[PDB]
Amino acid sequence: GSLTEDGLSYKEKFVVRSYEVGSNKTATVETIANLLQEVGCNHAQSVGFSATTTTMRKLHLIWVTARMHIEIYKYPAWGDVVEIETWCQSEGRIGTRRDWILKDSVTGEVTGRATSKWVMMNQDTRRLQKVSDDVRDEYLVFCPQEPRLAFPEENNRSLKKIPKLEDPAQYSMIGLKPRRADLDMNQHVNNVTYIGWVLESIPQEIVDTHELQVITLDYRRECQQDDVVDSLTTTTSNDSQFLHLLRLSGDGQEINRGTTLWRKK
Amino acid sequence: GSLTEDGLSYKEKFVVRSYEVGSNKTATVETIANLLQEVGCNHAQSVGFATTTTMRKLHLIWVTARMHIEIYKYPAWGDVVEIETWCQSEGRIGTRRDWILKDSVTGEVTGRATSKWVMMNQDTRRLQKVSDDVRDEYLVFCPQEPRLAFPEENNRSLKKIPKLEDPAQYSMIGLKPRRADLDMNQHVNNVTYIGWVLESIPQEIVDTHELQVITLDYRRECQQDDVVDSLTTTTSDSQFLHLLRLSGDGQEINRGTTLWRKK
Ligand SMILES: Cc1cccc(NC(=O)[C@@H]2CCCN2)n1
Numbered sequence: 001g002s003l004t005e006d007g008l009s010y011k012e013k014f015v016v017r018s019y020e021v022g023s024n025k026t027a028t029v030e031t032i033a034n035l036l037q038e039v040g041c042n043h044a045q046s047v048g049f050s051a052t053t054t055t056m057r058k059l060h061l062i063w064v065t066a067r068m069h070i071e072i073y074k075y076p077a078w079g080d081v082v083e084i085e086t087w088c089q090s091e092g093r094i095g096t097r098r099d100w101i102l103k104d105s106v107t108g109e110v111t112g113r114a115t116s117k118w119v120m121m122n123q124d125t126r127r128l129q130k131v132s133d134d135v136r137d138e139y140l141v142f143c144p145q146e147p148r149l150a151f152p153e154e155n156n157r158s159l160k161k162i163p164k165l166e167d168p169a170q171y172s173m174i175g176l177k178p179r180r181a182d183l184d185m186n187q188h189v190n191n192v193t194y195i196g197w198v199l200e201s202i203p204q205e206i207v208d209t210h211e212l213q214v215i216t217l218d219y220r221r222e223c224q225q226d227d228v229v230d231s232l233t234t235t236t237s238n239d240s241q242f243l244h245l246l247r248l249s250g251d252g253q254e255i256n257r258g259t260t261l262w263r264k265k
Numbered sequence: 266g267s268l269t270e271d272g273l274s275y276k277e278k279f280v281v282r283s284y285e286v287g288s289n290k291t292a293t294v295e296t297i298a299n300l301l302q303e304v305g306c307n308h309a310q311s312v313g314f315a316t317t318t319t320m321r322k323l324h325l326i327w328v329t330a331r332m333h334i335e336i337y338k339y340p341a342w343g344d345v346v347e348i349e350t351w352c353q354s355e356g357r358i359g360t361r362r363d364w365i366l367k368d369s370v371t372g373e374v375t376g377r378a379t380s381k382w383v384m385m386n387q388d389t390r391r392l393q394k395v396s397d398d399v400r401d402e403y404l405v406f407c408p409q410e411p412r413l414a415f416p417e418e419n420n421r422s423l424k425k426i427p428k429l430e431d432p433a434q435y436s437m438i439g440l441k442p443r444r445a446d447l448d449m450n451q452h453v454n455n456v457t458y459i460g461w462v463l464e465s466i467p468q469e470i471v472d473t474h475e476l477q478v479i480t481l482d483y484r485r486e487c488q489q490d491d492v493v494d495s496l497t498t499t500t501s502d503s504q505f506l507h508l509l510r511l512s513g514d515g516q517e518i519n520r521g522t523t524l525w526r527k528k
């Protein structure tokens with residue numbers, strides 16, 4: 001792991017582990033999501049962070065994921081080396097954006113890519129707020145000035161509006177509770193757990209015969225350690241499209257909504 | 266990762282990750298358990314393999330019967346941990362795999378583990394003893410003299426574990442494995458059972474104590490569509506008796522003990 005020559009992006013190589021792969025002997029989307037999270041943490045640390053700025057720590061402010069979009073072309077196999085390059089960019093007063101590029105270390109080809117939108121939030125009240133000018137100047141020195149997008153395209157699927165799943169759902173997984181392994185160092189539910197929960201309502205036959213190509217997730221609320229979640233899915237469509245919804249088992253309070261795209265093996 | 270000079274043990278270094286640590290910014294016991302599992306896989310791959318030639322022919326696999334882990338120091342986020350692992354034959358009973366955990370900077374032993382594996386027909390799940398034809402093909406990869414991570418006589422790794430009596434002091438019910446809890450063969454990962462056992466331990470004990478020892482006896486395998494109940498009772502430092510059983514019929518899948526020290 002190290003910053004590039006300009007110090008405006010970070011790269012890191014990972015060797016895929018035995019417990020990180022699924023039935024096809026290739027990394028699961030949750031292993032990929034964990035690796036993107038790890039390379040992002042190492043980028044923040046290499047440029048002197050802990051990724052709250054000095055003004056953010058004084059004002060009790062944190063960065064929270066509002067959207068996560070992951071597109072995979074090839075899943076690295078058990079024992080393969082994957083190289084991930086990551087960088088951040090300012091999106092004015094709306095918040096920050098973090099992008100990733102996944103490459104096979106042997107061939108050098110792009111085997112995946114991801115984009116995420118982060119919004120500023122008061123750690124205590126959970127009220128979102130626009131990025132002030134004092135905060136923007138502290139993280140602009142670590143971002144490229146010209147726009148560098150993992151999903152540049154004229155009409156990329158990373159900025160598409162996601163509708164709300166209508167009851168009844170076609171498929172469902174009820175009673176999902178996070179355990180201690182699902183909590184981070186700050187005792188909050190890890191963002192990768194929501195991905196695993198969304199995919200729990202997808203039938204095992206679809207998983208066994210299709211590969212996950214795209215996943216877009218919109219985060220609306222955070223799930224607590226003592227909260228129970230219901231995962232809901234409906235087919236919207238070789239390819240297979242699904243609409244997803246995560247809500248609290250009790251009151252039905254929405255925590256997440258998303259879409260997945262799968263292709264035939 | 267590489268075998269040692271004699272080719273009778275394997276070493277590998279790991280840099281502790283952000284998502285691998287708990288609230289005290291040190292690796293969880295499940296991260297340690299996953300790393301031991303990974304170094305064991307890499308040892309088997311480096312010597313030409315889990316199943317052997319005459320084991321695939323007879324549909325036979327190795328299954329964990331017991332896991333015993335003792336931790337002195339939990340590696341912190343960003344630290345390098347070196348793990349050395351080796352196997353040994355235990356006659357016709359089965360195989361044993363041992364591990365030594367060391368801080369890569371200080372060279373100090375910060376943990377150690379031992380596990381007992383029994384032979385089983387993959388299809389019928391019947392145990393049966395080890396034959397001499399399989400013993401000879403794995404003896405060339407094991408030290409001949411006994412090399413034990415837990416040498417001391419009358420140690421915590423070979424102690425009989427009793428069955429938890431109802432009612433349990435603490436409990437966590439309705440535990441279901443997800444796809445992330447399944448390995449490449451769609452079986453529940455043995456590290457998930459550790460996480461499930463520790464779910465019935467109260468959060469106050471976790472927040473004020475550190476896990477020093479964990480011993481687990483595996484009796485039955487949990488299926489993907491099975492639901493588990495985790496039960497705990499204080500037997501005492503803090504000692505606990507544990508039991509994992511199926512939520513329905515109450516069929517025992519695991520039993521164990523944990524030991525915790527005040528921070
Ligand atoms: C965008 C996003 C992601 C995750 C959590 C949240 N928000 C909250 O947890 C609470 C709900 C009321 C407002 N803030 N927002």
Ligand SMILES: Cc1cccc(NC(=O)[C@@H]2CCCN2)n1
Nearest residue numbers: 328329330390391483484485486
């Ligand atoms: C020692 C051990 C560990 C894990 C599973 C099993 N055995 C079984 O799954 C079943 C139970 C009775 C027939 N074999 N044994």
